[PDB]
Amino acid sequence: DPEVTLLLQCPGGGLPQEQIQAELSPAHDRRPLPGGDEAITAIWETRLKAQPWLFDAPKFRLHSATLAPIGSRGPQLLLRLGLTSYRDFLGTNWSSSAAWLRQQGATDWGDTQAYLADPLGVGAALATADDFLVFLRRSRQVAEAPGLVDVPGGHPEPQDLAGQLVVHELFSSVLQEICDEVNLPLLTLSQPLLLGIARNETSAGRASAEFYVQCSLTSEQVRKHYLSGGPEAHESTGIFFVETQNVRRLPETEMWAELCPSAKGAIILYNRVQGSPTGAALGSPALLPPL
Ligand SMILES: CC(=O)Nc1ccc(C#N)cc1
């Protein structure tokens, strides 16, 4: 799977909100492009002159994420974040020249990402009461990853002493994206756990935070809520469910080639952090069948 890299695997089966610190600093921003940010402005003008209904939006930028020594007391993760935008993403990560910007950043800053917007995404491994995970089919008419399988998620928009409000917005945003696209009541969802962070090498290394969320509804009830919105209530074109039993070997299935990179990251991290038991009971052969 060369199109996804793991940046972070969380300990303890995943981290809750109260164990994460954020540092939001202009030191964590993208560096100005070598020949100037006029190249980003030119791409944006070309795009608005064809699609004048498009609008910019601010985004969080991932600089890095440092885990505490395992088994320690106190905060377990530090997220180093800056600010970016949907315009800066289109002019850098989405540019045909994105590989040239990665080489230049290695040369100039010793950092392949230094000249890239790198907006932070969020995604969820969303489990039902009857032990399935939730998948969504992407429209074949989008420009990115057309027709591929996704999980619920999105790219959160801004508004430890500004830090704790930023961590709150990240955790809130993954629940809001489930409510908006799957049409589930907020009170049927658990507080999220952070499983880790995955990078999309097909989009010049931009990262997504991947979370585990439990729903109190069955697969049949989730399907009814999604469909009862009608075609205008969702961006996806369909919903479907895979037993958690069968997610373990998903990389060996024909479904794997249809999954977009950020969804592959969610499933790899679900399998390593929520699956993969360490104790004698769940590790016994009848409960963890060999192969
Ligand atoms: C939703 C989608 O198709 N992809 C996407 C959208 C916005 C950003 C940003 N900024 C990055 C990727």
Tab-separated table of C-alpha atoms and ligand atoms in Angstrom:
chain	number	residue	atom	x	y	z
A	1	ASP	CA	0.000	0.000	0.000
A	2	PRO	CA	2.424	2.699	-1.197
A	3	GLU	CA	-0.406	5.306	-1.291
A	4	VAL	CA	-0.780	5.354	2.568
A	5	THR	CA	1.905	5.844	5.320
A	6	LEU	CA	1.248	5.732	9.141
A	7	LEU	CA	2.561	8.870	10.929
A	8	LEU	CA	1.142	7.904	14.402
A	9	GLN	CA	-0.304	4.697	16.019
A	10	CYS	CA	-1.975	5.570	19.417
A	11	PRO	CA	-1.493	3.450	22.545
A	12	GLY	CA	-4.063	2.071	24.975
A	13	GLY	CA	-6.625	1.138	22.286
A	14	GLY	CA	-6.824	4.891	21.294
A	15	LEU	CA	-6.656	8.288	23.053
A	16	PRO	CA	-9.579	10.295	24.461
A	17	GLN	CA	-9.849	14.128	24.103
A	18	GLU	CA	-8.572	14.825	27.683
A	19	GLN	CA	-5.166	13.110	26.922
A	20	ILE	CA	-4.252	15.340	23.895
A	21	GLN	CA	-2.527	18.744	23.844
A	22	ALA	CA	-2.391	21.062	20.757
A	23	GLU	CA	0.188	23.822	20.003
A	24	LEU	CA	-1.380	26.147	17.322
A	25	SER	CA	1.503	28.448	16.164
A	26	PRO	CA	2.487	30.404	12.986
A	27	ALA	CA	5.868	28.517	13.304
A	28	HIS	CA	3.838	25.424	12.077
A	29	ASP	CA	2.593	27.167	8.870
A	30	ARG	CA	3.619	26.383	5.278
A	31	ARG	CA	6.771	28.267	4.083
A	32	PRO	CA	6.309	30.832	1.257
A	33	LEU	CA	7.045	29.207	-2.183
A	34	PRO	CA	10.587	29.751	-3.618
A	35	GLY	CA	9.408	32.055	-6.491
A	36	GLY	CA	6.615	33.541	-4.318
A	37	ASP	CA	2.970	32.662	-3.472
A	38	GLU	CA	1.871	34.412	-6.760
A	39	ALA	CA	1.831	30.856	-8.289
A	40	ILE	CA	-1.032	29.910	-5.822
A	41	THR	CA	-2.954	33.158	-6.600
A	42	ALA	CA	-2.671	32.424	-10.390
A	43	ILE	CA	-4.119	28.823	-10.034
A	44	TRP	CA	-6.974	30.217	-7.826
A	45	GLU	CA	-7.852	33.022	-10.351
A	46	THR	CA	-7.949	30.490	-13.250
A	47	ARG	CA	-10.283	28.243	-11.176
A	48	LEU	CA	-12.652	31.087	-10.075
A	49	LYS	CA	-12.907	32.335	-13.724
A	50	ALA	CA	-14.392	28.860	-14.655
A	51	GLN	CA	-16.334	28.186	-11.370
A	52	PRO	CA	-17.150	31.618	-9.823
A	53	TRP	CA	-19.407	29.972	-7.112
A	54	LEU	CA	-16.315	28.409	-5.385
A	55	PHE	CA	-15.229	29.881	-2.008
A	56	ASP	CA	-12.052	29.683	0.111
A	57	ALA	CA	-12.129	28.358	3.708
A	58	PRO	CA	-9.494	28.216	6.493
A	59	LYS	CA	-8.156	24.779	7.525
A	60	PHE	CA	-5.796	23.378	10.217
A	61	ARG	CA	-2.286	22.390	8.957
A	62	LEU	CA	-0.513	19.293	10.495
A	63	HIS	CA	3.197	20.037	11.188
A	64	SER	CA	3.957	16.962	13.433
A	65	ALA	CA	2.585	14.809	16.326
A	66	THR	CA	4.828	13.579	19.236
A	67	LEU	CA	3.665	10.714	21.513
A	68	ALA	CA	4.712	10.645	25.204
A	69	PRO	CA	6.793	7.632	26.451
A	70	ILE	CA	4.295	4.671	26.673
A	71	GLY	CA	2.711	3.964	30.077
A	72	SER	CA	3.344	7.544	31.403
A	73	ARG	CA	0.947	9.770	33.440
A	74	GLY	CA	-0.238	13.134	32.109
A	75	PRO	CA	-0.842	14.257	28.484
A	76	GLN	CA	-0.027	11.464	25.987
A	77	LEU	CA	0.151	13.358	22.625
A	78	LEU	CA	1.276	16.831	21.421
A	79	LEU	CA	-0.242	17.961	18.044
A	80	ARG	CA	1.784	20.789	16.392
A	81	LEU	CA	-0.711	22.675	14.150
A	82	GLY	CA	-0.613	25.759	11.904
A	83	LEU	CA	-3.223	27.355	9.630
A	84	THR	CA	-3.760	26.871	5.856
A	85	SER	CA	-6.692	27.125	3.376
A	86	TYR	CA	-8.609	25.362	0.571
A	87	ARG	CA	-6.935	27.854	-1.897
A	88	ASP	CA	-3.428	26.970	-0.665
A	89	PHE	CA	-4.265	23.197	-0.910
A	90	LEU	CA	-5.368	23.657	-4.620
A	91	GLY	CA	-2.107	25.537	-5.408
A	92	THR	CA	0.302	23.044	-3.662
A	93	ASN	CA	-0.835	19.437	-2.798
A	94	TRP	CA	-3.310	19.345	-5.775
A	95	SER	CA	-0.829	21.089	-8.231
A	96	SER	CA	0.644	18.979	-11.083
A	97	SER	CA	4.051	20.251	-9.715
A	98	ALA	CA	3.448	18.917	-6.129
A	99	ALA	CA	6.403	16.379	-6.418
A	100	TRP	CA	8.729	19.297	-7.438
A	101	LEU	CA	7.606	21.250	-4.293
A	102	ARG	CA	8.405	18.142	-2.109
A	103	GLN	CA	11.977	17.885	-3.620
A	104	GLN	CA	12.528	21.693	-3.135
A	105	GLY	CA	11.368	21.460	0.527
A	106	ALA	CA	13.871	18.603	1.162
A	107	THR	CA	16.672	20.774	-0.467
A	108	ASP	CA	15.822	24.129	1.257
A	109	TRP	CA	14.376	23.096	4.713
A	110	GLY	CA	15.173	19.333	5.084
A	111	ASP	CA	11.351	18.877	5.124
A	112	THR	CA	9.476	17.307	2.154
A	113	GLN	CA	6.247	19.069	3.405
A	114	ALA	CA	7.698	22.634	3.956
A	115	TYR	CA	6.055	24.103	0.765
A	116	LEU	CA	2.759	22.074	1.045
A	117	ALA	CA	-0.560	23.292	2.546
A	118	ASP	CA	-1.146	19.829	4.208
A	119	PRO	CA	-4.705	20.478	5.529
A	120	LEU	CA	-5.644	18.079	8.386
A	121	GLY	CA	-8.547	15.695	7.596
A	122	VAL	CA	-10.659	13.647	10.044
A	123	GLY	CA	-12.123	10.146	9.364
A	124	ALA	CA	-14.003	7.529	11.445
A	125	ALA	CA	-14.106	3.761	11.833
A	126	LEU	CA	-17.813	3.906	12.805
A	127	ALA	CA	-19.085	0.627	14.454
A	128	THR	CA	-22.788	-0.402	14.803
A	129	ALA	CA	-24.460	-2.136	17.811
A	130	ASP	CA	-24.503	-5.437	15.704
A	131	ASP	CA	-20.681	-5.184	15.038
A	132	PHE	CA	-20.327	-3.817	11.471
A	133	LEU	CA	-18.224	-0.888	10.211
A	134	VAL	CA	-19.884	1.806	7.959
A	135	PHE	CA	-18.680	2.493	4.312
A	136	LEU	CA	-19.866	5.210	1.799
A	137	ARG	CA	-19.630	5.181	-2.043
A	138	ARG	CA	-18.206	8.384	-3.633
A	139	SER	CA	-19.941	10.030	-6.646
A	140	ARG	CA	-18.213	9.106	-10.003
A	141	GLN	CA	-18.481	12.852	-10.986
A	142	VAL	CA	-16.078	14.342	-8.316
A	143	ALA	CA	-12.505	15.319	-9.447
A	144	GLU	CA	-10.717	13.448	-6.539
A	145	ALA	CA	-10.928	9.620	-6.003
A	146	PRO	CA	-14.027	9.290	-8.260
A	147	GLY	CA	-16.314	6.273	-7.627
A	148	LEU	CA	-14.146	4.989	-4.719
A	149	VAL	CA	-15.209	3.705	-1.246
A	150	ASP	CA	-14.790	6.117	1.732
A	151	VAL	CA	-15.522	6.221	5.490
A	152	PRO	CA	-17.316	9.180	7.187
A	153	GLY	CA	-15.163	12.324	7.550
A	154	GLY	CA	-14.212	15.796	6.321
A	155	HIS	CA	-11.680	18.682	6.674
A	156	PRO	CA	-12.525	20.828	9.785
A	157	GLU	CA	-12.582	24.704	9.675
A	158	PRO	CA	-10.988	26.817	12.525
A	159	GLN	CA	-13.530	28.745	14.797
A	160	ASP	CA	-2.685	24.509	25.822
A	161	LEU	CA	-4.819	27.682	26.360
A	162	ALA	CA	-5.976	28.078	22.735
A	163	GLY	CA	-4.845	24.344	22.446
A	164	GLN	CA	-7.770	22.732	24.359
A	165	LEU	CA	-10.401	24.543	22.212
A	166	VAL	CA	-8.636	23.285	19.047
A	167	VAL	CA	-8.592	19.626	20.338
A	168	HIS	CA	-12.334	20.067	21.211
A	169	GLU	CA	-13.081	21.295	17.605
A	170	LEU	CA	-11.242	18.245	16.085
A	171	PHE	CA	-13.223	15.673	18.212
A	172	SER	CA	-16.529	17.635	17.680
A	173	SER	CA	-15.919	17.818	13.897
A	174	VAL	CA	-15.780	13.987	13.417
A	175	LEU	CA	-19.196	13.616	15.186
A	176	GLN	CA	-20.703	16.575	13.212
A	177	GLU	CA	-19.476	14.937	9.879
A	178	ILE	CA	-21.204	11.622	10.918
A	179	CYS	CA	-24.472	13.527	11.762
A	180	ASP	CA	-24.351	15.579	8.473
A	181	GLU	CA	-23.574	12.691	6.008
A	182	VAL	CA	-25.032	9.536	7.708
A	183	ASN	CA	-28.059	11.472	9.182
A	184	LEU	CA	-27.610	9.866	12.677
A	185	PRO	CA	-28.789	11.516	15.888
A	186	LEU	CA	-25.792	12.884	17.895
A	187	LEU	CA	-27.048	11.065	21.073
A	188	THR	CA	-26.556	7.632	19.374
A	189	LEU	CA	-22.720	8.299	19.143
A	190	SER	CA	-19.880	7.595	21.713
A	191	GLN	CA	-17.155	10.179	22.436
A	192	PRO	CA	-14.472	9.490	19.775
A	193	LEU	CA	-11.076	7.854	20.472
A	194	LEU	CA	-8.073	8.923	18.324
A	195	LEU	CA	-6.579	5.764	16.698
A	196	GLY	CA	-3.674	7.517	14.843
A	197	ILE	CA	-2.693	9.674	11.849
A	198	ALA	CA	-2.309	8.430	8.220
A	199	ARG	CA	-0.758	10.251	5.189
A	200	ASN	CA	-2.172	10.100	1.552
A	201	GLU	CA	0.943	9.797	-0.699
A	202	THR	CA	-1.378	10.240	-3.791
A	203	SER	CA	-2.113	13.805	-2.487
A	204	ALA	CA	1.602	14.772	-1.773
A	205	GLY	CA	1.483	13.496	1.825
A	206	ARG	CA	-1.456	15.404	3.383
A	207	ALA	CA	-2.570	13.737	6.666
A	208	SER	CA	-5.875	12.704	8.291
A	209	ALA	CA	-6.564	11.993	12.006
A	210	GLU	CA	-8.434	8.612	12.171
A	211	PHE	CA	-10.965	8.020	15.052
A	212	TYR	CA	-13.093	5.119	16.458
A	213	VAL	CA	-16.787	5.949	17.140
A	214	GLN	CA	-19.416	3.458	18.423
A	215	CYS	CA	-23.146	3.867	17.506
A	216	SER	CA	-26.011	2.456	19.669
A	217	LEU	CA	-28.050	1.692	16.456
A	218	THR	CA	-27.908	-1.553	14.408
A	219	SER	CA	-26.746	-1.635	10.723
A	220	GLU	CA	-30.465	-1.823	9.646
A	221	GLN	CA	-31.347	1.322	11.728
A	222	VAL	CA	-28.210	3.219	10.381
A	223	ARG	CA	-29.262	2.341	6.764
A	224	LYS	CA	-32.839	3.641	7.405
A	225	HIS	CA	-31.511	6.999	8.847
A	226	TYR	CA	-29.078	7.520	5.888
A	227	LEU	CA	-31.735	6.713	3.223
A	228	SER	CA	-34.567	8.678	4.971
A	229	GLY	CA	-32.624	11.899	4.152
A	230	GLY	CA	-33.151	11.376	0.383
A	231	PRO	CA	-30.498	12.016	-2.310
A	232	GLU	CA	-29.894	15.738	-1.315
A	233	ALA	CA	-29.138	14.835	2.384
A	234	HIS	CA	-25.741	13.188	1.476
A	235	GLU	CA	-22.718	13.778	-0.894
A	236	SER	CA	-22.130	9.981	-1.160
A	237	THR	CA	-24.292	7.818	-3.550
A	238	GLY	CA	-24.727	4.752	-1.257
A	239	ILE	CA	-24.020	3.214	2.212
A	240	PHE	CA	-22.933	-0.371	3.058
A	241	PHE	CA	-21.637	-2.460	6.046
A	242	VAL	CA	-18.801	-5.031	6.621
A	243	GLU	CA	-18.771	-7.267	9.746
A	244	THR	CA	-15.868	-6.344	12.114
A	245	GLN	CA	-14.973	-10.092	11.850
A	246	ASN	CA	-14.254	-9.553	8.081
A	247	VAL	CA	-12.441	-6.131	8.380
A	248	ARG	CA	-9.418	-8.079	9.765
A	249	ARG	CA	-8.676	-9.513	6.218
A	250	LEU	CA	-10.052	-6.578	4.112
A	251	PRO	CA	-6.572	-5.908	2.512
A	252	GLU	CA	-6.829	-9.420	0.916
A	253	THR	CA	-10.295	-8.670	-0.684
A	254	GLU	CA	-11.277	-7.075	-4.082
A	255	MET	CA	-12.834	-4.201	-1.958
A	256	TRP	CA	-9.265	-3.000	-1.037
A	257	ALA	CA	-8.508	-1.704	-4.597
A	258	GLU	CA	-11.772	0.381	-4.439
A	259	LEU	CA	-10.890	2.127	-1.078
A	260	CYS	CA	-9.555	5.715	-1.211
A	261	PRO	CA	-6.220	6.237	0.646
A	262	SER	CA	-7.710	8.011	3.761
A	263	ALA	CA	-10.259	5.134	4.193
A	264	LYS	CA	-7.353	2.569	3.903
A	265	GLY	CA	-5.642	4.548	6.729
A	266	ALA	CA	-8.803	4.299	8.946
A	267	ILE	CA	-9.046	0.503	8.421
A	268	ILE	CA	-5.287	-0.209	8.960
A	269	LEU	CA	-5.389	1.802	12.235
A	270	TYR	CA	-8.726	0.126	13.358
A	271	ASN	CA	-7.115	-3.317	12.778
A	272	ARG	CA	-3.857	-2.431	14.680
A	273	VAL	CA	-5.342	-0.394	17.605
A	274	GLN	CA	-8.933	-1.754	18.270
A	275	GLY	CA	-8.296	-5.237	16.763
A	276	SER	CA	-4.995	-7.165	17.323
A	277	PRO	CA	-5.697	-8.297	20.960
A	278	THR	CA	-2.708	-8.606	23.421
A	279	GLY	CA	-4.286	-10.731	26.254
A	280	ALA	CA	-4.712	-14.516	26.765
A	281	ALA	CA	-8.572	-14.625	26.440
A	282	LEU	CA	-9.102	-12.660	23.130
A	283	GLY	CA	-5.755	-14.084	21.806
A	284	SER	CA	-6.922	-17.758	22.251
A	285	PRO	CA	-7.182	-19.629	18.830
A	286	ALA	CA	-11.036	-20.076	18.818
A	287	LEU	CA	-11.466	-16.215	19.262
A	288	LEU	CA	-8.403	-15.198	17.062
A	289	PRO	CA	-8.359	-17.836	14.305
A	290	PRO	CA	-4.869	-18.336	12.733
A	291	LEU	CA	-4.166	-17.000	9.169
B	1	LIG	C1	-13.340	16.668	0.189
B	1	LIG	C2	-12.378	16.295	-0.903
B	1	LIG	O1	-12.768	15.748	-1.926
B	1	LIG	N1	-11.069	16.575	-0.679
B	1	LIG	C3	-10.487	17.691	-0.026
B	1	LIG	C4	-11.230	18.825	0.274
B	1	LIG	C5	-10.637	19.903	0.898
B	1	LIG	C6	-9.290	19.867	1.209
B	1	LIG	C7	-8.670	21.008	1.833
B	1	LIG	N2	-8.288	22.000	2.267
B	1	LIG	C8	-8.537	18.744	0.904
B	1	LIG	C9	-9.132	17.660	0.283
